[PDB]
Enzyme design. Structure first.
Site, mmCIF file in Angstrom:
data_model
loop_
_atom_site.group_PDB
_atom_site.id
_atom_site.type_symbol
_atom_site.label_atom_id
_atom_site.label_comp_id
_atom_site.label_asym_id
_atom_site.label_seq_id
_atom_site.Cartn_x
_atom_site.Cartn_y
_atom_site.Cartn_z
ATOM 1 N N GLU A 105 -5.224 -8.156 -1.068
ATOM 2 C CA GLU A 105 -6.215 -7.756 -0.071
ATOM 3 C C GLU A 105 -7.593 -7.642 -0.712
ATOM 4 O O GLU A 105 -7.804 -6.860 -1.653
ATOM 5 C CB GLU A 105 -5.851 -6.452 0.631
ATOM 6 C CG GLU A 105 -4.548 -6.548 1.387
ATOM 7 C CD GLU A 105 -4.198 -5.269 2.136
ATOM 8 O OE1 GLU A 105 -5.121 -4.494 2.490
ATOM 9 O OE2 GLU A 105 -2.990 -5.054 2.377
ATOM 10 N N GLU A 161 0.820 -1.222 0.000
ATOM 11 C CA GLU A 161 0.000 0.000 0.000
ATOM 12 C C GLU A 161 0.853 1.273 0.000
ATOM 13 O O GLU A 161 0.613 2.207 0.760
ATOM 14 C CB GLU A 161 -0.952 0.012 1.207
ATOM 15 C CG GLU A 161 -1.871 -1.221 1.320
ATOM 16 C CD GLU A 161 -2.866 -1.097 2.475
ATOM 17 O OE1 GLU A 161 -3.599 -0.070 2.514
ATOM 18 O OE2 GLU A 161 -2.912 -2.021 3.350
#
Length: 493
Positions: free
Chosen positions: A295, A173
């Site tokens: 994710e 991320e």
């Protein structure tokens, strides 16, 4: 009735078992309590890892496990988690925050966990706040078979031979909590960091670059254009969030509108995967580079009265449908998507398991993964479909179906009925068979749209025999229950 034609003699590709992957961050009670109880815990355990969870995960056939996080991974300094356990660094938060990190679960405990489970390790290294040497030394520590400060340290800490590891994430991320980076900047760092991650001995690294959040197509374009030759995979993150971020909505006691919205947002995965893959095809037409959805899953407001930072939410038949429907999407894209990791193994987000001290339960999401395990590494079969619509203005397909053949020759057809109000008739035509088959079935359903398991009632929602179908001369007509995930196993003869 929905109509489906299965062409059993026509193979479309292989469903990589890693599509059934999982993800556990040092967050809330995912690692601590959820898995790691410590060697001296009264909770029965194998070397500090609770046995009830271990056994459940082994039955489910977890193929790969990502650690130590999303956001945590670009804050983590791996050396904090090796060495004499009782002397490792400790961080404690005396606030509602609830940050108690004793580093008792580190690299050695994680590799041990994966060996216990029979799964592949997938480690996420720290780009946002780490250094190139730090990451390079982690790989050396784990995989080097010669003599060096790092390899010698591993041996002193009790692991003589090097470990094997394929999956290595180079930052998580990074557009956000991993450093708030422009794609262009991350791409430069990615290229530099990955340079120094070596293949030692017989080990072969499978390097995975941080990919887009949701519909950030510019990220995918930049990473592919700038860095494709230096990666073996590129990730993608997409959570199913019913309401606005500020008020996501509850895991149970929700409205019928929230049902339809959740499923509609889940199915949006297909558009995301399709469009990100289309950009990947421009730079990588041979599809060398894996798309990795590391994710995904539902994200609700936490259960009332709990710490919002811990991300603890219940898990209902609605989540089962999200799981089954998303897995089917990955199957359809198994020519490019080769791994996915649902967000958060235990006590965190869309978990397969929840625990409360010595007690644990299996969620409806667990049951979907356990039932669908038959699809791991199976051959995807060509299927044509014409399915009825459901939901407001027919915005959803009533049914989602996928067919594959296992190595032992058995065919499995999984079907989700997205409508909570009525059953779904499905007429399945089986072609290219050569012989005949018999069929059995199992189904996961509920009498309430938020039907879930609790510690006092851990088996309220669980798989049961499915017999509401008729198999006659290459036609399988099935009456799926409302809000259900079903698997049909067909055996030749």
């Amino acid at each position: 009735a929905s109509r489906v034609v299965v062409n059993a003699d026509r193979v479309k590709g292989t469903i990589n078992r890693n599509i059934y992957g999982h993800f556990s961050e040092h967050l809330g009670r995912c690692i601590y309590e959820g898995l790691w109880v410590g060697e001296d815990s009264p909770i029965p355990n194998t070397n500090g890892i609770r046995n009830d969870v271990l056994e459940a995960l082994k039955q489910m056939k977890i193929p790969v496990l990502r650690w130590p996080g999303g956001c945590f991974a670009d804050e983590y300094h791996w050396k904090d988690g090796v060495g004499p356990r009782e002397k490792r660094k400790r961080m404690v938060n005396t606030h509602w925050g609830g940050v108690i990190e004793n580093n008792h679960f580190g690299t050695h405990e994680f590799m041990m966990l994966c060996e216990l489970l029979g799964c592949e390790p997938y480690i996420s290294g720290n780009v946002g706040s780490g250094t190139v040497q730090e990451m390079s030394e982690w790989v050396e520590y784990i995989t080097f078979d010669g003599e060096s400060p790092m390899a010698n340290w591993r041996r002193e800490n009790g692991r003589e031979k090097p470990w094997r590891i394929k999956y290595w994430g180079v930052g998580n991320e990074n557009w956000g909590c991993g450093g708030n980076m422009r794609a262009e900047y991350y791409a430069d760092l990615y290229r530099q960091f990955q340079t120094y991650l070596r293949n030692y001995g017989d080990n072969k690294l499978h390097k995975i670059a941080c990919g887009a959040n949701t519909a950030d197509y510019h990220w995918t374009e930049v990473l592919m254009k700038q860095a494709a030759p230096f990666m073996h995979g590129l990730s993608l993150h997409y959570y199913t969030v019913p309401g606005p971020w500020e008020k996501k909505g509850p895991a149970t006691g929700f409205t019928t509108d929230e049902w339809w919205v959740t499923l509609k947002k889940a199915l949006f995965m297909d558009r995301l995967v399709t469009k990100h893959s289309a950009i990947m095809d421009v730079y990588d037409p041979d599809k060398r580079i894996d798309l990795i959805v590391d994710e995904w899953g539902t994200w609700y407001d936490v259960e009332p009265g709990t710490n919002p930072g811990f991300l603890y939410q219940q898990n209902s038949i609605r989540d089962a449908l999200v799981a089954g429907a998303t897995l089917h999407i990955f199957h359809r894209h198994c020519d490019r998507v080769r791994m996915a990791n649902i967000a958060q193994l235990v006590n965190v987000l869309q978990s397969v398991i929840l625990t409360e001290g010595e007690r644990m339960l299996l969620t409806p999401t667990y049951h979907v993964f356990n039932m669908f395990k038959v699809h791991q590494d199976a051959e995807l079969l060509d299927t044509w479909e014409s399915v009825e619509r459901t939901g407001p203005e027919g915005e959803l397909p009533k049914v989602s179906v996928s067919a594959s053949r296992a190595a032992d020759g058995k065919i499995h057809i999984s079907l989700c009925n997205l409508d909570f109000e009525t059953g779904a008739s499905v007429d399945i035509e089986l072609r290219g068979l050569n012989g005949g088959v018999s069929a059995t079935g199992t189904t996961l359903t509920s009498g309430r749209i938020d039907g879930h398991n609790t510690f006092d009632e851990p088996e309220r929602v669980k798989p049961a025999p499915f017999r509401d179908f008729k198999l006659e001369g290459g036609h399988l007509n099935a009456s799926l229950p409302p809000m259900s995930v079903t698997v049909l196993e067909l055996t030749a003869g």
